[PDB]
Amino acid sequence: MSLQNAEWYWGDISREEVNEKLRDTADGTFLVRDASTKMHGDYTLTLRKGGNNKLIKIFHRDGKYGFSDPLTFSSVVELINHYRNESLAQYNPKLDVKLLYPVSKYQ
């Protein structure tokens, strides 16, 4: 399971725990947790940008993953890996960042 071994995936932690980790960190710092929803296989990307934590929803429909219509990524790691090298600006002009610094559960 590529996702469970991903250093930046923290599974079932709270909004409050994530806020502790993201506190005072540089823009581009990010982790992924499970969505507060009941297991739609849904995850939440939290991203540091402009001094606050952006909550970005990772949708899971058919067998695909993504931030909006259409869902085209075959895994959440594939998705996150993509936006490590490409800004999220095309989804929302306020989000002119990449996923730069992973919050690592090994580190």
Partner: peptide, 11 residues
Amino acid sequence: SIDYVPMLDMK
């Protein structure tokens, strides 16, 4: 944003 960041569709 209000809670979750609005992300635009590409379709």
